[PDB]
Amino acid sequence: VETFAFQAEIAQLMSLIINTFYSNKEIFLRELISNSSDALDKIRYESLTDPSKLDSGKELHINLIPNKQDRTLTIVDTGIGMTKADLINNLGTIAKSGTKAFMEALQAGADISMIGQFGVGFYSAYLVAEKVTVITKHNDDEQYAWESSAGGSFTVRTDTGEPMGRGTKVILHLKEDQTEYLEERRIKEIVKKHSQFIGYPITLFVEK
Ligand SMILES: COc1ccc(-c2c(-c3cc(Cl)c(O)cc3O)noc2NC(=O)C(C)C)cc1
């Protein structure tokens, strides 16, 4: 297991998200579904010139899986997946400018809900989660697990759990007072409100 420091600017963003009073927390789900949709768009496009890229799975979709026993909400997609370089360095490089822009906007009076316009919507996960685990598999790279409970650091390791084929699984370990996001009615409501027109099937799993 390797441990890394977030860039200062990203740690700052995460602290703001965690510490600011903001009741409209439900937007985290729109942001993560948006990221999944983007990753799905990417594998779809790439497959047009190289059909073999779908050898690791032809179906392009998003699954939402609540688990009250584990207090987790999992978002699974079969998008392009992230590489080790994506996880450790490259996405963060991009996230630095996006964060700076977002912070300046919040000063100009913007609100947290516009976070996605700056390409850093993932971090809105920390509105509802005490820990986030991201399992991801890109073609021709290994399956990795990224994890952070904030506090300035994240970890990356090669994942030895069940193989995914291709794509990304975001596991939100919810805060004790945010369990409403495990309720079927509530998830349906949020998807209908914010993610109505996503161009991939979204399947909301029900609990046993
Ligand atoms: C907006 O920034 C983004 C950065 C990366 C990704 C992404 C994901 C992914 C990531 C998160 Cl956090 C998620 O919840 C769901 C996902 O499927 N998997 O592969 C990816 N690679 C790309 O999309 C490349 C064009 C870089 C999506 C959006």
CA pair distance 130, 33, nearest whole angstrom: 19
CA pair distance 114, 31, nearest whole angstrom: 10
Instruction: Give the orientation angle of helix 27-49 with respect to helix 184-194, to 10 degrees.
Output: 60
136-168 as b/e: b if 16+ CB within 10 A: bbbbeeebbbbbbebeeebebeebeeeebebbb
Containing structural domain, residue 163: 1-208
Ligand 1 atom at minimal distance to the Cα of residue 86: 26
Of 82, 84, 88, 83, give the one whose Cα is nearest residue 4: 88
Beta bridge partners of 157: 145
If one counts every other C-beta atom within 10 angstroms of the C-beta of residue 104, the result is: 11
Cα–ligand 1 centroid distance for 182 (angstroms): 23
Q: What is the CATH number of the domain that holds 124?
A: 3.30.565.10
Q: Which two tokens stand for residue 112?
A: 């947290």
Q: How was this structure determined?
A: X-ray
Q: 39 CB under 6 A from ligand 1? A: yes
Give how many domains the chain has, as a whole number.
Answer: 1
Rg of the chain's alpha carbons, rounded to an integer? 17
**Known binding residues for ATP:** 35, 77, 96, 122
The H or E element that residue 188 is part of is helix 184-194
Give the resolution in Å: 1.7
Of 22, 42, 177, 192, give the one whose Cα is nearest residue 111: 22
